[PDB]
Amino acid sequence: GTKRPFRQNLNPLVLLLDAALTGELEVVQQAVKEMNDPSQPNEEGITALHNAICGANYSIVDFLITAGANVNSPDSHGWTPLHCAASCNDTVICMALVQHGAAIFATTLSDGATAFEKCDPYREGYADCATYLADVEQSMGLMNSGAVYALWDYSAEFGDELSFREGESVTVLRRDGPEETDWWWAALHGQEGYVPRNYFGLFPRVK
Secondary structure, three states: OOOOOOOOOOOHHHHHHHHHHHOOHHHHHHHHHHOOOOOOOOOOOOOHHHHHHHOOOHHHHHHHHHOOOOOOOOOOOOOOHHHHHHHOOOHHHHHHHHOOOOOOOOOOOOOOOOOHHHOOOOOOOHHHHHHHHHHHHHHOOOOHHHEEEEOOOEOOOOOOEOOEOOOOEEEEEEOOOOOOOOEEEEEEOOEEEEEEHHHEEOOOOOO
């Protein structure tokens, strides 16, 4: 025990990530106060919220979302918190993410899969989680008078596309245009144009 010298400047992120994973709510709470950024990723693109979800620590998921953890943060492989939650058929976490601004149509980096597609047919809760995510997919651009919330800036690359800012309420006019499966015809400040599905949530972010 003698030999190892003590560290004077421990990294709150390393403590946060470990706590989020093992299930140490109080450690996570103190670590969040300490640093600016709870949503800060490690090398792999893994956040407190990722670890909390894979650890199945519902109390820490809830605390991290409320404190304004990035519900859309992709890891190295383009897996969002919603992808991870779906892969465990975790309907309760899927609901909490969607309700705090998760992008239902977000696609992974390699092979371009949605959260719905990551549901595990050989584990409890498959039907419940698949049903929920498919219902959110259906509901998007239909609920809230077609209003959906931009989760990033976008710059039109053709004249029939709509530019928009992070946070802006965009109104979907037509979804199922057979001409585009990944794009909606939408309205913002009396402009009309195609917007990409995967940029939007059913609810806004927390600040």
